[PDB]
């Protein structure tokens, strides 16, 4: 299943305050209007690719979605990031886990015998090497996950919503929740749910963005410069307003089709 991403997944690229300024930057962003893939709790958390990075979201109120899993092979033969968001806190672990058939978490029975998750149920882990650890529908919970030079980052934005069906049109921006110099190689991922919900995914790309920082230091508008010839013009003029005119953005250059290699035949 798919739907339109609109503006979603804009985040503060660096920890600098700026205001009333149209700062231009090259980084991994979710491209404007790109399709997200969409998923459901009705019998759906296979190993996705991660590509350059993931935008994620869920529309929630049940809070059955409670984490994420990442790596190359996710099977203890490498270190695997686990993120949890249980009760009140983001909680993070990076052990050599050995996950069950599904990221189904395990769940909270009647309290009379004490009630807790069992670490999935089948096996869940088969080695330690836990090189890091940490502790901190009505709502949409946006996130971004990227790794560059071993710095894995989490960003987020929590907001109320009315559109049950899709990612809402409009705008909002994500501050970093966490930055982690943990150095793990990530090319695939999964999401945790409890076992008794819907989530979204799209992939980041290296893009130029023009970012309108407002008077309160806050990013409140963005241009994805590569989206279309108009957005190339907005970034060419460093401006969200373009007047009636004609503007050179670039040079259209026929890409090389193949590599034709010749040497003396000796």
């Amino acid at each position, epitope marked *: 299943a798919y739907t339109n991403s609109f503006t979603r997944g804009v985040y503060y690229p660096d920890k600098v305050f700026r205001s009333s300024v149209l700062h231009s930057t090259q980084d991994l962003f979710l491209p404007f209007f790109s399709n997200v893939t969409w998923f459901h709790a009705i019998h759906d958390n296979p190993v996705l690719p991660f590509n350059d990075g993931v935008y994620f979201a869920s529309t929630e109120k049940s809070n059955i979605i409670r984490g994420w899993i990442f790596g190359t092979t996710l099977d203890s033969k490498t270190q695997s990031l686990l993120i949890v968001n249980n009760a009140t806190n983001v909680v993070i672990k990076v052990c050599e886990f050995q996950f069950c058939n599904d990221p189904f978490l395990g*769940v909270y029975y009647h309290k*009379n*015998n004490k009630s807790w998750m069992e670490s999935e149920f089948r096996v869940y882990s088969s080695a330690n090497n836990c090189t890091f650890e940490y502790v901190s529908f009505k709502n949409l919970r946006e996130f971004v996950f990227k790794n560059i030079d071993g710095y894995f980052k989490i960003y987020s934005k929590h907001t109320p919503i009315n559109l049950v069906r899709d990612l809402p049109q409009g705008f909002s921006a994500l501050e970093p929740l966490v930055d982690l110099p943990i150095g793990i190689n990530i090319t695939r991922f999964q999401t945790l749910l409890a*076992l*008794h919900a819907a989530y979204y995914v799209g992939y980041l790309q290296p893009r130029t963005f023009l970012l309108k920082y407002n008077e309160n230091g806050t990013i409140t508008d963005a241009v994805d410069c590569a989206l279309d010839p108009l957005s190339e013009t907005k970034c060419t003029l460093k401006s969200f307003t373009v007047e009636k005119g004609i503007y050179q953005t670039s040079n259209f250059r026929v890409q090389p089709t193949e590599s034709i290699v010749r040497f003396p035949n000796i």
Partner: antibody
Amino acid sequence: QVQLVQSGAEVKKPGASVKVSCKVSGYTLPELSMHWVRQAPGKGLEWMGGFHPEDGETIYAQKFQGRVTMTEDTSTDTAYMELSSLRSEDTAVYYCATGSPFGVVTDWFDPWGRGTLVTVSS
Amino acid sequence: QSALTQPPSASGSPGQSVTISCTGTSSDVGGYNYVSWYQQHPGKAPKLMIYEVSKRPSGVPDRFSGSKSGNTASLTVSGLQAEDEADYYCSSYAGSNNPYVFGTGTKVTVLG
């Protein structure tokens, strides 16, 4: 779904003591309202104890209380009925049961574990 | 507490429908009857049968149902043959959380 499994069949003397385990399988023990019940052989049943979901109390039937006891182990997922100081009417089947079951997801119905027939004689 | 008792057999010829009854001191304490039924076939273990005098467990072939109220409870047996030939014990399950007790049994059989 959960399965309940009795300790086969058993024989102990009058004035001696018997412990019957019940294994539970598919899923773990503490989540389950474990209960225990007598049967006079091929005749009427009678209660002797069980975990209420109120307070987790392993309460007992007054006709057998203190002399009958219950205990548990998570390491094997075994419940236990232990009946001390055996008497003429203790040539019973002892049934394991629980109003719970679960499958990670929560549930509440009362399956039974077939129960150990026991002989008591001199 | 919710003590209870029942008739010996309630038997009938093959293909009959018959009514099990249970009678006692009170309802299951705290509301309508939590009384539940357990069906033991000749020489074999009990199955769970109708519970709270209304709720039907898995695998029941529709030929069984609950009845009556207060200090009494009842269960229907229909089309009776082998394996329907069984002892239908009543027992009380008040809130799942107030002390349980068990009936004298009612052993139906294909009437010889």
